Design a protein around this ligand. Structure first.
Ligand SMILES: [Cu+2]
Ligand SMILES: [Cu+2]
Ligand SMILES: [Cu+2]
Ligand SMILES: [Cu+2]
Ligand SMILES: [Cu+2]
Ligand SMILES: [Cu+2]
Ligand SMILES: [Cu+2]
Ligand SMILES: [Cu+2]
Ligand SMILES: [Cu+2]
Ligand SMILES: [K+]
Ligand SMILES: [K+]
Ligand SMILES: [K+]
Lengths: 422, 422, 422
C-alpha cells in the first residue's frame, strides 16, 4: 500500500531525553516501537521538540534523517523494510543515545491487518456507477435519494459522523440523457437530526432543486426537473450550513449524456475528493468531531477520495487491464479546495475542460485543476501494466489521506518501460 | 435573504455554565437573545468552549445541533423561523439547562432593518458598466480615473478604510475596441495619504502603465497606450505594497472588444471578487483595520463581491427577466484567492476560458475557475424564474460574505422545475 | 530592482516607546536605521505591537503610513529614495516622538551590494535549456541525472539544504521528440543522505519511472521508457516523503516535442515555481531548516522562481529585444500551490492550456492558472521596450520572494505607450 508514516518529536519525558510518538498507534508513547511489515515503505517524520541537535538513525538499514537543529526543525526520510527482525533507531548526536534517545522498529512477516473501527463503511466503490445509456429517446426517469447520518469509518480505529446520500460518500452516480425529465424522490431518514436537501448543478431553477427539497427527518420531498444541457455535474446537499453538509459527505455526480452518448470506453470509474475538518490532527485515532473554526478558515485535516482514508487503496482500488481505454468521472465536493488531479505513471488522452461535454476535450494532459463544485472527465488508454496512483498533486495532501490505486496486472518490464539500458 | 447566522460558544461566565455569543450583536453576551424575523432561515454555530458535553435545542421548532464532546468540537444547524414569538434554546445534556444553559430566540414580524453604518456605500452596482461599443473604426479615447481613499461600509455596523478608483469597488468598468488609443488621465484626490497608480492587463508596456502613473495626492498623471489585443482584463493600482492597494479596493475591469463586438445579449453585469484581511474576526462590528500578517500569509476574514457584505444581496442585487440571455463580466481582484465562480440554479452556456475573447468559448459549464488578476465572461439564457445565487464554490466563503443574488420574477412551478411528480 | 522592504512593529523596549525591526538586517533592533540606495523604492510595513495609536512619517519625503489603532493593526507604504542623505522617520501621534518613536533612513549613493551568503548558487538560469530539436526521426536519447544534496543560498545572508537534480533548481530542462526512447541514467551522489528517484509526467508506466529509480547514495539506476505523447511535463523526485523531496528543490521540466516541433520563436525561457517551508519567518537571515508542520499544513515561507530569492531579478534575469517573439516554459514544482502566472506589461498571445501541445493554444490571455505538478507554454511578441515582471498573481507572494524580471532595452516613450496626451 501507501507508506506507513510515523511521527516522532524529541523531548524530555519520564526523566530522560527521548523521542515521543505523535498520532497513530504511538501517540504520546516514549521511544515507541514502530511496528511494520516486511516489504513496507516506512516513512519517519522527525520534529525537534526542545531545541537540542538531533537525528534518527536506523541501525541496520542505514537510513537516517538529516540533523535537525532548532525547535520545530524537521526532517523526513523513508526506507523499505526488506528484512524481518528487530532494529534499533537512535540519535547519533554525541551523548543522546546514552541520554535515552533510542527505540525499536519491529519488521514482522506477513501483511498488515485490514483497517477496522467501530464505524460503518461509508466508501463508494469507484466501479459503482450505471454504465452508458442506450440509444433511447428522452424520457421521465425516477430517482430515489435517502439522506442518512451515520457513524462512519474515517481511518483505521477512527470514526466520524458522516451525512450522506444513500449511506456512502460520494452519493450515487446519477446518469441521464439530455432532454430527460427527472423525478426526484428525496427521503430524509427519521433518525436524522438535521434537515437535508439537494442542489444539482445540472438542474435549471431555484437552488438547483434545493428550493423544492428542504426535507425534514422522517419526510419526503419530490421535485421534477428537466435536464437541458449535457455535462458532468456535481450535486450536493443545500441546507444551511451548506459547507458543513458538504464536508460531512453530502456530494455526488450527475452525468447528463449528450444525445449520442460519450465516446465508448472499456471501463469507467467514479471518484470524488472532499475534506474533513476534525478537532484533532490527521492521524489521531478515536471518535473525531468537526471543528468549525478549521472549516470556515479552510484548515482541513483529512483530504479524501470516496469517503475515507484508504478508500481507494485498501478498501476498493480501481482495477483495469492492459490495452483498455479507461474513463474516470472525477468531481470535487470540497467544500473548499481545488484539486490538481493526476494519475501517476499515466497521461490523460482526453480532458473534458470544466466538465464541458459539448466542447472538444483537450488532448495529452498530465494534470487537471478541478474546482470545488466542479467535475471533469478524463479518458486514457492503459498501454502497460502497473500500479497507477490517483493524487491531488498538491502533494502534502498524500499525507492527509489523499491517494488511490489503479491496479493493472502484468509484467514489470516491457518495451514501453523497463529496467536497464535500451 | 442569506441566513442570519449566530455563533455560540459554551463556557463558564457570571458564575454559571452558559452560552456566550461570538461576533455580531451578541459578542461576549451571556445566553444572548437571538433576534430574528419571520420567514428567515436561522443558522446557529455551536462551538464547545470548555470540554463538557453540549448541544443546542430550539424549543417548539424541533431544531437542534448534534452533541459536541471535546473543546473546539462544533455543530452547525438551521431552521426557518416560520412562527412569530419568543422561544427557548437550551442544552439538553442532563443538568445543563438548570446549570444555566438557556437563552431566548425572538422571532419578530416584518423584515430585518437595512444594513447601516457610519461608512459610505462603496459598492459597485453590477449594472453599472458602459454597454457595447457600436461598429466604429479604432480611435483615440479619453479615460478619466480618480483614486479616492474613503471610510466605507464593510458590513452592518462595520467600517473599513477603502482605497478605490472613483469611490467604489470594483472601479469603473472601462470598455474600448481593439486598436483604440487610450489617453488615461489619473487624478489622485488631494486628501489621499498614499500615492496611487494603475496597471491595466490590457496595456502593453512598463507596468501595464504603472511606470507612467505613480500619482502623488492632488496631482494628475497622463499616459496614452494602445489596446493591441481583445480580451477582458483586470486593472489595479500598482504602487507598492501592491497586495495592500488591491485588498483595500483598487481593482476593476477593462474590456477590449474584438472587431465585431461580443455576441449581443439582453443584459450585461459587472462583478469582481476580492478579500479583506481585518485584525478582528469576520462578523465583529466596529471600525476594522488591516492585519498585515493575515494579508501576507493569505488568511482572509472577508470575501466580497463588489466591495461589501450584502453588496449583491441587499444593496444592489442583479435583476433580469425570464427568457433573457445574460452576460457576466467576472474578475478576481484578489489579491490572493482563486474563485470557483458558479451561479446556483443555472448553467453557463458559454465560458470564455481564461478571459480569452478570440478563442471559442467552452459550452455548457457549471463552475469556472478564475485566478486573482484574471477575469472571464460567462453567458447564459435564463430559462425560468427564481432567485439565482452567485458564489465562489469554495463554500466556506459563503459565511465570510461571498454571496450574490440574481432575481428573476415569475412562478415557482413550471415545466422546467416544479414540486411533485411528473 | 524589487522594493526594499522593512517591517517595524511598535512596542516598549529598552525603557521607552519605540519601533522594533522585524527580520532582514534590522531584526529585533530598536528604532533601526533603514539603509537604502539612491533611486530604490522603499516599502515600510508598520504593525501595531502594544495597542496605542501610531503611524510612521518620513521627514522630508512626505511619505507616511495610515494611523494604526489596535494591536496587530497594520499599514504599509512606500516612497522612492531619490535624495541621498539621512532622514528621520517618526510617529506623529502626540508625545510619541518625544517618548522615543524615531529612527533614521540612510539613503546612500550607488547600488546595493549583490546578494551574498555562505551557500552555493543553486538557481537555474532561465536561458539554460536545450533549443528546438531537429526535424529528425524518432531515436534513442540518453539522459543523465545526478541527485545532489547541497547547502544553497536561499536569500541574502540565508541558506538552506536543497536537494537537487544536478545541483540547480529546477533540474535540467529535458527535451525529446514524441516516439523517442529515453534511456535515463540516475546517479545519486555518494554524499547524499537520502535515496532519490525520478517520476516523469511524460513517461508511461510504474511511478512514471519512480518504481525503477529508487537510488541509494553512491549508486546508479537506469531505466528506459518511450515518450508516447507530446506535451510539457513536470518531473520530480518520487521518494517518500515526496512533498519533502519536491519542496527541497527536486523538480524540472521535460518537453516531448510534437512531430513538427513547436512554432518557431526568437527566444525560449525555462521557469519553475516552488515553495519552501522554513522554521523561521520569511526574511529571517541565517541557516534555515524545514518545518514539517508548515509543509504538511500548506503554510509556506518562501515562494520562489528558479530556486532562490532574487533568482530572476538580480542573479539571472530574462533578457530579450523589442520585436522578438518569446516563449516561456513555465511549470509548478509546488509541492502545493497553484500559480496565477502573469507577465506585468505583456499579454500572452498563445497559452497551451493545461500544457497540451496537441490542442490549439488559447489566444490573448492575461494570466494562466498552473497547478502544482503541471506546466504550460506561453508565447508572446514583445512590441516595445521595458522591464516586464513575472509574477504569480496571488500577489502577497511578491513579499515571499516570488518575482522575476524580463529586461527589454529601448526607449521609454513610443506609440504603443508614452507619457502625456495623444
Ligand atoms: Cu538527539
Ligand atoms: Cu444535508
Ligand atoms: Cu453547488
Ligand atoms: Cu451542555
Ligand atoms: Cu493605490
Ligand atoms: Cu496585475
Ligand atoms: Cu506612536
Ligand atoms: Cu529525492
Ligand atoms: Cu508528479
Ligand atoms: K496511456
Ligand atoms: K439556462
Ligand atoms: K505583446
Amino acid at each position: 500500500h501507501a507508506p506507513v508514516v510515523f511521527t516522532l518529536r524529541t523531548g524530555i519525558a519520564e526523566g530522560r531525553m527521548v523521542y515521543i510518538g505523535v498520532g497513530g498507534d504511538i501517540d504520546h508513547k516514549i521511544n515507541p516501537t514502530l511496528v511494520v511489515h516486511e516489504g513496507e515503505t516506512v516513512q519517519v517524520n522527525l520534529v525537534n521538540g526542545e531545541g537540542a541537535q538531533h537525528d534518527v538513525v536506523v541501525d541496520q538499514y542505514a537510513a537516517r534523517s538529516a540533523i535537525v537543529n532548532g525547535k520545530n526543525a524537521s526532517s523526513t526520510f523513508s526506507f523499505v523494510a526488506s528484512k524481518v527482525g528487530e532494529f534499533n533507531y537512535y540519535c547519533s548526536i554525541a551523548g543522546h543515545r546514552q541520554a535515552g534517545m533510542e527505540g525499536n522498529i519491529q519488521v514482522l512477516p506477513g501483511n498488515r491487518a485490514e483497517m477496522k473501527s467501530s464505524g460503518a463503511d461509508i466508501t463508494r466503490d469507484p466501479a459503482d456507477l450505471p454504465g452508458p445509456i442506450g440509444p433511447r429517446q428522452a424520457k421521465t426517469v425516477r430517482i430515489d435519494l435517502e439522506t442518512v447520518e451515520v457513524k462512519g469509518q474515517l481511518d483505521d480505529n477512527t470514526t466520524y459522523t458522516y451525512w450522506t446520500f444513500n449511506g456512502k460518500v460520494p452519493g450515487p452516480f446519477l446518469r441521464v440523457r439530455v432532454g430527460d425529465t427527472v423525478e426526484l424522490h428525496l427521503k430524509n431518514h427519521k433518525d436524522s437530526l438535521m434537515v437535508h436537501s439537494v442542489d444539482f448543478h445540472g438542474a435549471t431553477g431555484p437552488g438547483g432543486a434545493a428550493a423544492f427539497t428542504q426535507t425534514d427527518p422522517g419526510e419526503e420531498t419530490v421535485v421534477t426537473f428537466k435536464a437541458l444541457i449535457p455535462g458532468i455535474y456535481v450535486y450536493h446537499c443545500a441546507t444551511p450550513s451548506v459547507p458543513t453538509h458538504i464536508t460531512n459527505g453530502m456530494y455526488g455526480l450527475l452525468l447528463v449524456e449528450p444525445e449520442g452518448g460519450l465516446p465508448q470506453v472499456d471501463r469507467e470509474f467514479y471518484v470524488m475528493q472532499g475534506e474533513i475538518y476534525t478537532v484533532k490532527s490527521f492521524g489521531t485515532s478515536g471518535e473525531q468531531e468537526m471543528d468549525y473554526e478549521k472549516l470556515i478558515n479552510e484548515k482541513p485535516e483529512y483530504f479524501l477520495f470516496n469517503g475515507s482514508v484508504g478508500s481507494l487503496t485498501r478498501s476498493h482500488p480501481l482495477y483495469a487491464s492492459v490495452g483498455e481505454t479507461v474513463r474516470i468521472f472525477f468531481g470535487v465536493g470540497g467544500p473548499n479546495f481545488t484539486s490538481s488531479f493526476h494519475v501517476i505513471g499515466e497521461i490523460f488522452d482526453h480532458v473534458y475542460s470544466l466538465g464541458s461535454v459539448v466542447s472538444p476535450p483537450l488532448i495529452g494532459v498530465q494534470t487537471v485543476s478541478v474546482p470545488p463544485g466542479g467535475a471533469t472527465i478524463v479518458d486514457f488508454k492503459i498501454d502497460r501494466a502497473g500500479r497507477y496512483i490517483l493524487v491531488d498533486h498538491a502533494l502534502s495532501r498524500l499525507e492527509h489521506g489523499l491517494v488511490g490505486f489503479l491496479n493493472v496486472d502484468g509484467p514489470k518490464n516491457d518495451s514501453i518501460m523497463h529496467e536497464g539500458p535500451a
